[PDB]
Amino acid sequence: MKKILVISDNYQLVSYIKNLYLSNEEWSKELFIDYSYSSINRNPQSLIELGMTEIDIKNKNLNELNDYHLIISAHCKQIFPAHIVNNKLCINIHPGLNPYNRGWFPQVFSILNKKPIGATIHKMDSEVDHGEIYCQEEVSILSHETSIDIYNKVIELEKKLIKNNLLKIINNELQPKLPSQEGNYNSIQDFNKLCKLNLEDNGSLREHIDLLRALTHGDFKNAYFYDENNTKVFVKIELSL
């Protein structure tokens, strides 16, 4: 048997992994799996409801990780320090098509800059969303779709990748390969610049609809303007066939 550590702050992916273990005898006869959410998760209830434990991977002593054959990050909210990724096999499930729009909310950037979007399972190195790729697949962006629409496709794709590839990766059956290039990276500040709308901006209606749809994601409060009295107004769009 092997011990496996999954660090996730996404209910859907951890639930999915849990369900694969309970329904697949190869998993349950071979693997022990601990699951933890990150200490910086501000709302972890739904994860605590599944019996997960908190972990702070930035302060976790290397020593306490010796048993683990490997570590999986499924939408972990923390950057793994260099010392962790360089001394333990760490594998990340990322909601973007590396190396395009690495970093924050890839589908928001892809709606705007037209680079590929998708899902990627990859080895972690000390950089973000950077290490060698085990599998990935693209998804499309249609004219009517917002962030949340594409994000939902990506999650479904991540589930597919996990189902078809995760056990092979754990069993050293799958061999990864360098990304074709360095790619591009988008930060939280970049997302924040986009959210601060400029009512004076000159552009096509197309460009403005695309900005609003990239920034439309459920109840998240993203895009805003200030009006002539300095009242803050958030803005989202709805597109329907």
Place this chain on the structure above:
Amino acid sequence: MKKILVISDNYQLVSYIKNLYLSNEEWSKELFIDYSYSSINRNPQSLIELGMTEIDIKNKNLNELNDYHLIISAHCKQIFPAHIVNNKLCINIHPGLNPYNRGWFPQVFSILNKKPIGATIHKMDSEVDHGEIYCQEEVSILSHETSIDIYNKVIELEKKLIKNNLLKIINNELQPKLPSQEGNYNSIQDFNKLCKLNLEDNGSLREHIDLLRALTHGDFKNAYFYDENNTKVFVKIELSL
């Protein structure tokens, strides 16, 4: 006593007028009120439920209307023929500030063109939304508001104008005044042109957000574009404090 005919295709206004009658001794003691919806109303069920009768005022024979002291239009879907307005006292309750943005959906156009918006009770002549004005009041348009937001304010003000003035008009206690200018009439085709978005249109973000809020009104399917594959996509905006 006086016989009054009310032609309305608007559940709220007709219901309000019926409520004032039921609640105000000055009304029940002085008035008999007949109520009809237009023969062209495609979904009159809610009005039929009030026991209202169908009328086609474009075909109605004038001799059949002799008993009426006056006729009130309250969001009537038909243009009254010259013969009717020139031989019966006809009064319209209009959800715009005449003479600005007369005709269709005044508040849509005011969001776009910044002309005043409001409600008006006026005498009907053979032109639309054009006769002498008994009373009217402006409402304002706030940065976060859509068509439906402003429309709701108009309807409320329509109630206040009725409550305060409609009996005075009926009893010849309030004399109307010419509109300040000829003004501008928007047609249905004008509305439909605005709905056909041009994705290549160049404008400020302001401009584009204003066009989309002018066209956002609950579940009506108004603004659309065609994508690359000629799929029709409807667009609404949400603005929120």
